[PDB]
Design an enzyme around this catalytic site. Structure first.
Site, short mmCIF file in Angstrom:
data_model
loop_
_atom_site.label_atom_id
_atom_site.label_comp_id
_atom_site.label_asym_id
_atom_site.label_seq_id
_atom_site.Cartn_x
_atom_site.Cartn_y
_atom_site.Cartn_z
CB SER A 19 -2.78 -7.59 3.42
OG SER A 19 -3.70 -7.62 3.11
CE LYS B 75 -2.70 -5.99 -0.37
NZ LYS B 75 -4.12 -5.90 0.44
CB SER C 217 -6.20 -3.86 2.70
OG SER C 217 -4.80 -4.83 3.29
CB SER D 270 -6.96 -10.54 8.02
OG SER D 270 -7.84 -9.83 6.94
C1 LIG Z 1 -4.58 -9.27 3.35
O1 LIG Z 1 -4.17 -9.51 4.46
C2 LIG Z 1 -5.78 -9.03 2.41
N1 LIG Z 1 -6.15 -10.50 2.92
C3 LIG Z 1 -7.01 -11.26 2.40
O2 LIG Z 1 -7.47 -10.66 1.27
C4 LIG Z 1 -7.83 -12.66 3.09
N2 LIG Z 1 -8.56 -12.08 3.81
O3 LIG Z 1 -9.26 -10.96 4.41
C5 LIG Z 1 -10.38 -11.34 5.19
C6 LIG Z 1 -11.29 -10.90 3.17
C7 LIG Z 1 -10.65 -9.82 5.32
C8 LIG Z 1 -10.57 -11.85 6.08
O4 LIG Z 1 -11.90 -12.42 5.26
O5 LIG Z 1 -9.87 -12.09 6.86
C9 LIG Z 1 -8.16 -13.64 1.95
C10 LIG Z 1 -7.35 -13.74 1.15
S1 LIG Z 1 -7.37 -15.24 1.02
C11 LIG Z 1 -7.48 -15.62 2.53
N3 LIG Z 1 -8.00 -16.75 2.99
N4 LIG Z 1 -7.76 -15.25 3.37
C12 LIG Z 1 -6.73 -8.26 2.91
N5 LIG Z 1 -6.77 -7.68 4.16
C13 LIG Z 1 -7.45 -6.84 5.09
C14 LIG Z 1 -6.86 -5.98 6.31
O6 LIG Z 1 -7.00 -6.65 7.20
O7 LIG Z 1 -5.64 -5.51 5.94
C15 LIG Z 1 -8.30 -6.46 4.22
C16 LIG Z 1 -9.29 -5.04 5.24
C17 LIG Z 1 -8.85 -6.61 3.37
S2 LIG Z 1 -8.06 -8.18 2.51
#
Ligand SMILES: *C(=O)[C@@H](NC(=O)/C(=N\OC(C)(C)C(=O)O)c1csc(N)n1)[C@@H]1N=C(C(=O)O)C(=C)CS1
Length: 261
Positions: free
Chosen positions: A43, A46, A103, A210
């Site tokens: 992320s 973004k 995010s 993440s």
């Molecule tokens: C960006 O990095 C987003 N990450 C995700 O959508 C994934 N997992 O993130 C979470 C749900 C927090 C996790 O359990 O690690 C993802 C998508 S496909 C996959 N295998 N994992 C968003 N980023 C964050 C961040 O850390 O900035 C979030 C707060 C919300 S999800």
């Protein structure tokens, strides 16, 4: 021991792979560790999508207030802001804020769709002289973070250079630069990451990410009280798909490289 020795030791203890790039804007000096190696951005990508929309807004004074319809079908795996607005609208500015500060993955997808697809985010990065960044997918799949997969990757140095250009440098017109900085400073997701390795009263703007493979990332601009800004990218990834994320490693890396500043 030296900063480099400290980073190598951190990586050795980590059970994964650490990437660090710090740019000290006082003298343009750098602290680099695997900084030319590719990591999945997750992320943290973004920032590039939001900035691409800000760039468009330079030449379209109605863009940031443009309504975007939010539908139930737009919801994905993580969308705490967009879900509040299903059946209503959010402006492009509100989607930028939600993507960056919470995010919100639906918000990211609306930005990408507005721009015309992931490749348009890549083209924007290239317009800033970043030959490394690539966006290939929408959310959530851009976060699969599979080792060796080039999709949705960049290097710590490329991202630090581009983040510096975006937030402190020549990428955006002033109003849009300031808006990006406001968004990053108001991030809610980064408490335990780079921020946790720094003095509590330093002003910081950041974007976390993440993904799978315990991929745990943060990119930040840091304003010390008595020093020029620092730009810091900390990327971390692990060999096993279901590894826990490790924000503590990012905090530890931040503490190591900002010592003395
Ligand atoms: C960006 O990095 C987003 N990450 C995700 O959508 C994934 N997992 O993130 C979470 C749900 C927090 C996790 O359990 O690690 C993802 C998508 S496909 C996959 N295998 N994992 C968003 N980023 C964050 C961040 O850390 O900035 C979030 C707060 C919300 S999800």
């Amino acid at each position: 021991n030296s900063v480099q020795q400290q980073l190598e030791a951190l990586e050795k203890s980590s059970g994964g792979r650490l990437g660090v790039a710090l740019i000290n804007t006082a003298d343009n000096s750098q602290i680099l560790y695997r900084a030319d190696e590719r990591f999945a951005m997750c992320s943290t990508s973004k920032v590039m999508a939001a900035a691409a929309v800000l760039k468009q807004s330079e030449s379209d004074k109605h863009l940031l207030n443009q309504r975007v319809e939010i539908k139930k079908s737009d919801l994905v795996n993580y969308n705490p802001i967009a879900e509040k607005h299903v059946n209503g609208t959010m402006t492009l500015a509100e989607l930028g804020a939600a993507a960056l500060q919470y995010s919100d993955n639906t918000a990211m997808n609306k930005l990408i769709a507005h721009l015309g697809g992931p490749d348009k985010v890549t083209a924007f990065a290239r317009s800033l002289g970043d030959e490394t960044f690539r966006l290939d997918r929408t959310a959530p799949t851009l976060n699969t973070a599979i080792p060796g997969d080039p999709r949705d990757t960049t290097t710590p140095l490329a991202m630090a250079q581009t983040l510096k250009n975006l937030t402190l440098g020549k990428a955006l017109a002033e109003t849009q630069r300031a808006q990006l900085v406001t968004w990053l400073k108001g991030n809610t997701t980064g408490s335990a990451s780079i921020r946790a390795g720094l003095p509590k009263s330093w002003v910081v703007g950041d974007k976390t990410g993440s993904g799978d493979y315990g991929t745990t990332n943060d990119i930040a601009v840091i304003w010390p009280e008595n020093h020029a800004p620092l730009v810091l990218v900390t990327y971390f990834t692990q060999p096993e798909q279901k590894a826990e994320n490790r924000n503590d490693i990012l905090a530890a890396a931040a503490k190591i490289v900002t010592h003395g500043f």
